[PDB]
């Protein structure tokens, strides 16, 4: 991805977009009960903690574009992945406006709390004033579609979240690209059935894990991965995607029956953005935040890995490449050992910056003991080995509980953490509950005991 130009929004006919400048994050009742080092990300150029230009840091993710066209290996990757998706019999029909708006089997309704994007965000008009979940009314929406059309600018927001000290000082805050409600609705109508098919089919056929339930899905994964596992991390995956990857994606879509609406992918690839009082144009780069983002990033990941394997290991048998992606995150396997370091090398030529799985310093062999997916390890249950525990380390959880974005959601926030933490074992879980209950706020929460979560887990399969 590469920013073509950037300039005052007024010069191109756009209003200044006002965005929050103060974080909603504040020390929670457990701030000093648990250890942590993360703080709220910088949200403005005038933040006292900044040790470098803010605007420069937040846009540096656009490292540029390394490839213009779709080469021989990419076409091969496209044919193989498309043929594989072909076996799911995905309904290629367009999804009606009502379902695209309020949901249907395999697709949740539109999130009524997130931004409505441009121009609504500039007219002070919110989603709540456009759709009614009880009515499933599509009259206002329709009227808005006809009035403002599609292919509207995306609104760039800084993500209000916890970041490390380094990332705070280096102004490395992440950005959200809120697309207009019109495009979101248009895209969910165009790809609604594709999204549904993926959500209902997490695994090695879609090569996607979006819409999955770790508690249940973890037990299915091992029986889907071949003998040798391999994985690696990406640096600025979304922003690094070159236009060629979007073209490769459209080819996949064409081959599976959606060639009818590949133009919507151009909207993602060559995108128009609004940030504060500036407007900019980007060539390449996936708009992190847009509807379908997760799925399209996952699809492109399936193309990338296949491409690097073809380029690096001619004669590789893609039919035995078993991988599951969730955006840039991936867990892959092959009957034979492969060199991630070599693949990483090939990756550079495709505009991808690949590094050792889980911040390792060197490319080490990935095993079932050290592999992670969505920050979770895999651990067989001591009593019933066929049941696999998704284990997220307590560090992440400790960092999160020390802050709050709304005192009214303390119960939900802490319960959420509990559903992640109990998998670390009973000894650990109880220590966690005890600390929570060492302060008044914690003692007033209704939290599930270990044996309760274990029983609930077994009863969920
Ligand atoms: Na883009």
UniProtKB/Swiss-Prot annotation:
Q: Which reaction equation describes what this protein catalyses?
A: RNA(n) + a ribonucleoside 5'-triphosphate = RNA(n+1) + diphosphate
Q: Which cofactor does it need?
A: Mg(2+)
Q: How does it sit in the membrane?
A: Peripheral membrane protein
- Per its Swiss-Prot or TrEMBL record, what regulates the activity? Replication or transcription is subject to high level of random mutations by the nucleotide analog ribavirin.
The source's domain of life comes to: Viruses
Compartments annotated for it: namely: Host cytoplasmic vesicle membrane
Instruction: State the organism named in the record.
Output: Poliovirus type 1 (strain Mahoney)
Where are the Cytoplasmic topological domains?
1-461
Residues annotated for Mg(2+) 2 binding in this entry: 233, 328
Ranges of residues in domain RdRp catalytic = 227-342
Name used for this protein in its record: RNA-directed RNA polymerase
Residues annotated as binding Mg(2+) 1 are 233, 328
How does the cofactor bind to this protein, according to its record?
Binds 2 magnesium ions that constitute a dinuclear catalytic metal center. The magnesium ions are not prebound but only present for catalysis. Requires the presence of 3CDpro or 3CPro.
| Function per UniProt | Replicates the viral genomic RNA on the surface of intracellular membranes. May form linear arrays of subunits that propagate along a strong head-to-tail interaction called interface-I. Covalently attaches UMP to a tyrosine of VPg, which is used to prime RNA synthesis. The positive stranded RNA genome is first replicated at virus induced membranous vesicles, creating a dsRNA genomic replication form. This dsRNA is then used as template to synthesize positive stranded RNA genomes. ss(+)RNA genomes are either translated, replicated or encapsidated.
> What is known about its subunit structure?
Interacts with Viral protein genome-linked and with protein 3CD.
């Amino acid at each position: 991805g590469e920013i073509q130009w950037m300039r005052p929004s007024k010069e191109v006919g756009y209003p200044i977009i006002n965005a929050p400048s103060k974080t909603k994050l504040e020390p929670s009742a457990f701030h000093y009960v648990f250890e942590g080092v993360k703080e709220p990300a910088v949200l403005t150029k005038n933040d006292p903690r900044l040790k470098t230009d803010f605007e420069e840091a937040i846009f540096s993710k656009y490292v540029g574009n390394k490839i213009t066209e779709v080469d021989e290996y990419m076409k091969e990757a496209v044919d193989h992945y498309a043929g594989q998706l072909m076996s799911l019999d995905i309904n290629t029909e367009q999804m009606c406006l009502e379902d695209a708006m309020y949901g249907t089997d395999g697709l949740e309704a539109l999130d009524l709390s997130t931004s409505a994007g441009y121009p609504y965000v500039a007219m002070g008009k919110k989603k709540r004033d456009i759709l009614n979940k009880q009515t499933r009314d599509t009259k206002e929406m329709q009227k808005l579609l006809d009035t403002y059309g599609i292919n509207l600018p995306l609104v760039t927001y800084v993500k209000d979240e916890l970041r490390s000290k380094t990332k705070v000082e280096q102004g490395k805050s992440r950005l959200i690209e809120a697309s207009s409600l019109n495009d979101s609705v248009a895209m969910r109508m165009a790809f609604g059935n594709l999204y549904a098919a993926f959500h209902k089919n997490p695994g090695v056929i879609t090569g996607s894990a979006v819409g999955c339930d770790p508690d249940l899905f973890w037990s299915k994964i091992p029986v889907l991965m071949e003998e040798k596992l391999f994985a690696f991390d990406y640096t600025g995956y979304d922003a690094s995607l070159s236009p060629a990857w979007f073209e490769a994606l459209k080819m996949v879509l064409e081959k599976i029956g959606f060639g009818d609406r590949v133009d919507y992918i151009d909207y993602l690839n060559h995108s128009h953005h609004l940030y504060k009082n500036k407007t900019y144009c980007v060539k390449g780069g996936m708009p992190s935040g847009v509807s379908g983002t997760s799925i399209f990033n996952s699809m492109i990941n399936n193309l990338i890995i296949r491409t690097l394997l073809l380029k690096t290991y001619k004669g590789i048998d893609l039919d035995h490449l078993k991988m599951i992606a969730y955006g840039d995150d991936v867990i892959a396997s092959y009957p034979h050992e492969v060199d991630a370091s070599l693949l990483a090398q090939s990756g550079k030529d495709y505009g991808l910056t690949m590094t050792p799985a889980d911040k390792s310093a060197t490319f080490e062999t990935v095993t079932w003991e050290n592999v992670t997916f969505l920050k979770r390890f895999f651990r067989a249950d001591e009593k019933y080995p066929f049941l696999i525990h998704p284990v997220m380390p307590m560090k992440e959880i400790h960092e999160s509980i020390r802050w709050t974005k709304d005192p009214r959601n303390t119960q939900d926030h802490v319960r959420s953490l509990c559903l992640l933490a109990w998998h670390n074992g009973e000894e650990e879980y109880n220590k966690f509950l005890a600390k929570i209950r060492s302060v008044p706020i914690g003692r007033a929460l209704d939290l599930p005991e270990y044996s309760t979560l274990y029983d609930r887990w077994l009863d969920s399969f």
